[PDB]
Paper text:
SARS-CoV-2 Mpro is a cysteine protease that acts as a symmetrical dimer and displays positive cooperativity for substrate turnover. A series of potent reversible covalent peptidomimetic aldehydes and nitriles was designed as Mpro inhibitors. To examine the detailed binding mode of the compounds in the series, crystal structures were obtained of SARS-CoV-2 Mpro in complex with the 4-methoxyindole containing compounds 1, 3, 5, and 7. The overall binding pose was similar across the four compounds and in line with what has previously been characterized by Hoffman et al. The P1 group inserts into the S1 pocket of Mpro, and the cyclopropyl moiety inserts into the S2 pocket, whereas the indole maintains its position across these analogs.
All four compounds show a covalent linkage to the catalytic cysteine, Cys145, with contiguous electron density between the sulfur and carbon atoms and the C-S bond distance 1.76–1.77 Å. When the warhead is an aldehyde (compounds 1 and 3), the resulting secondary alcohol hydrogen bonds with the Cys145 backbone nitrogen. Compounds 1 and 2 (both containing aldehyde warheads and a γ-lactam at P1) displayed sub nanomolar Ki values (average values of 450 pM and 250 pM, respectively). Accounting for the hydration penalty, compounds 1 and 2 bind extremely potently, with a likely affinity as low as 10 pM. Compounds 3–9 showed clear evidence of reversible binding, whereas the more potent aldehydes formed a kinetically stable complex with Mpro, with compounds 1 and 2 having estimated half-lives of >69,300 s and 30,500 s respectively. Even at a 5-fold molar excess of compound 1, covalent complex formation did not reach saturation, whereas for compound 5 near 100% covalency was achieved in the unquenched condition. Covalent binding of compound 5 was fully reversed within 1 h, whereas compound 1 binding was unchanged for at least 4 h. CSPs due to compound 1 binding displayed a pattern typical of slow exchange or non-reversible binding where the signals for both the bound and free state are observed with signal integrals representing their relative amounts. Taken together, these data were most consistent with compound 1 forming a 1:1 stable complex with Mpro but that there may be two or more bound forms of the compound 1:Mpro complex. A second peak was observed at the 28-min time point at 63.9 PPM, consistent with the thiohemiacetal expected upon covalent compound binding.
Author numbering:
A (entry chain A), B (entry chain A): 1 to 303
């Protein structure tokens, strides 16, 4: 038993991280087939970051201006293009370690593993959720851009995130692998504020089901509620509205534990209205919302 | 910025996980050079687990009774021995993916990454600490035995843990790669209780330094204390005694933040005596003790 914030095994993605240097800037790139994907602000100087005109800046760049290094192997760049906020550099060599992969744009509330990298070599792995405000609470320093977030389905790596920027509140922002930012953010050094960080309600319910499964059950009460009589309490505490689709997603967990979704909702309402009173749930003194129901089933079933 | 529970990239260890089957039992094994290491209770039946005589049980086993599978490749077993609580099966093929590796027995308070596996294939990665009572708070189901914990120094994988058992309190127990259990535990199905789970004080101080670095500083006070006048409060709350060696280990962090270790100790005393009062530190409502000072420096420096 036991429930942990668990990340996917990262070897398949480790095999795809390279170093991209342009001018003074060095960041990470993702090498799949004969293409290297990287953030486009690799072509910016410290001066261009305030007000970059990426077309004009990119037009002054030739193939040989892009230094791509996989380990110690220098890749030859034979073409380059810009798709939204992502540069795509064509190299002359297909990555021998290219896995079965997809490009997926995940929905808010979904989770994925981030492989934090620096200078094209891996540094660490951790699990993140796409917040309702399209940010992530990660751990990124300078040079971490180009690091990717991904999921794994058997052997297919679904790349969903590439890191671009840290916001003033310390959360992080990025794009999908097609270069489209999650949320309203843009890749320049201006005043950018993320909106209200609301809680992923279905994820908290899934985490409570994981708690029940792993023995923690003090938070279970004799009450029940209705979906509207749960939402009029969730909106007060900045919780995402619970829909019948969320209820059905939580179906298998409710059937495994024998606890109706609305009764667990009553327990969660009691937790929101009275707090933890100094107790913990699965070793946490906060309500955790970065586990999807799929994460819970996968970790409690051994996938 | 940002501070996360971060695990090592697991590809080098993924390349070493195989499936070991004996009779009905199937668990994981670690394939390095021409040797596969696995827990010895792979030779037990459900009946032998209460009172196993591992010499007598192993003596009834021949090489061909050990089915080793790396992916779909069947390894041929050409010898077998028992070292403490670990079986070592000699195979005819050296693992082509054997990394630079060490066998290390870590001290309590140190951390490592666990690669949770089932049927010899990886399932997830997460960071754990060796508690002062020589247990770990992991996530292990049936068939997870043989999963390993490790650290990485540039390119050298230091294997330090192999999982064997879950205790009644839901924490987990295991051996080093030489087969010696951490703590007083034995690999049989008897009444085994871990002792008092005390807190790794130096790790909480390192985590508070990480908090200060990442902007969280509300817990900083105008007070100071002495080491004895901190220990007579730490022992009340079941905190490991702080030694001058722990102070010196925290030296670089204190010099980077400009906060003396004893002043941070006064802040921690205030936290232990008055609680969090509904606040959070680095997104946690509890004092975290599974980050070593090295973990903090590594994550805030980008190693
Ligand atoms: C790429 O490696 C890097 C990400 C690192 C830097 C520090 N922490 C991280 O997450 N990205 C950047 O430095 C980008 C530059 C790209 C054009 C987007 N900029 C920021 O992350 C950035 C800019 C600003 C502010 O600008 C006014 C204000 C507050 C925080 C900021 N972060
Ligand atoms: C090996 O895969 C497995 C580890 C799994 C099983 C459930 N959770 C895990 O961590 N190990 C075992 O099942 C071992 C068997 C080996 C001889 C040690 N046994 C236990 O983990 C075990 C035994 C008992 C109890 O026995 C009285 C009481 C309470 C909890 C127990 N766990």
């Amino acid at each position: 038993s036991g429930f942990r914030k668990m990340a996917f095994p990262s070897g398949k993605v480790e095999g795809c991280m390279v170093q991209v240097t342009c001018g003074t800037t060095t960041l990470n790139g993702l090498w799949l087939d004969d293409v290297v994907y990287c953030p486009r602000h690799v072509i910016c100087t410290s001066e261009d970051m305030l007000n970059p005109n990426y077309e004009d800046l990119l037009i002054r760049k030739s193939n040989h201006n892009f230094l791509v290094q996989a380990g110690n192997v220098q890749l030859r760049v034979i073409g380059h293009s810009m798709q939204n906020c992502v540069l795509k550099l064509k190299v002359d060599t297909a990555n021998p370690k290219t896995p079965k992969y997809k490009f997926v744009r995940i929905q808010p509330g979904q989770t994925f593993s981030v492989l934090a990298c620096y200078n094209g070599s891996p540094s660490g792995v951790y699990q993140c959720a796409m917040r309702p405000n399209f940010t992530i609470k990660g751990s990124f320093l300078n040079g971490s851009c180009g690091s990717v977030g991904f999921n794994i389905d058997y052997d297919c790596v679904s790349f969903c995130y590439m890191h671009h920027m840290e916001l003033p509140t310390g959360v992080h922002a990025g794009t999908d692998l097609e270069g489209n930012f999650y949320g309203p953010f843009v890749d320049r050094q201006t005043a950018q504020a993320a909106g209200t960080d609301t809680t992923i309600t279905v994820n908290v319910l899934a985490w409570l089901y994981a708690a029940v499964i792993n023995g923690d059950r003090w938070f279970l009460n004799r009450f029940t509620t209705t979906l509207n009589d749960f939402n009029l309490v969730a909106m007060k505490y900045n919780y995402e509205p619970l829909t019948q689709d969320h209820v059905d997603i939580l179906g298998p967990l409710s059937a495994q534990t024998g606890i109706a979704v609305l009764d667990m909702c009553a327990s969660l309402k009691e937790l929101l209205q009275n707090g933890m009173n100094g107790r913990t749930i699965l070793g946490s003194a906060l309500l955790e919302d970065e586990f999807t129901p799929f994460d819970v089933v996968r970790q409690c079933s051994g996938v």
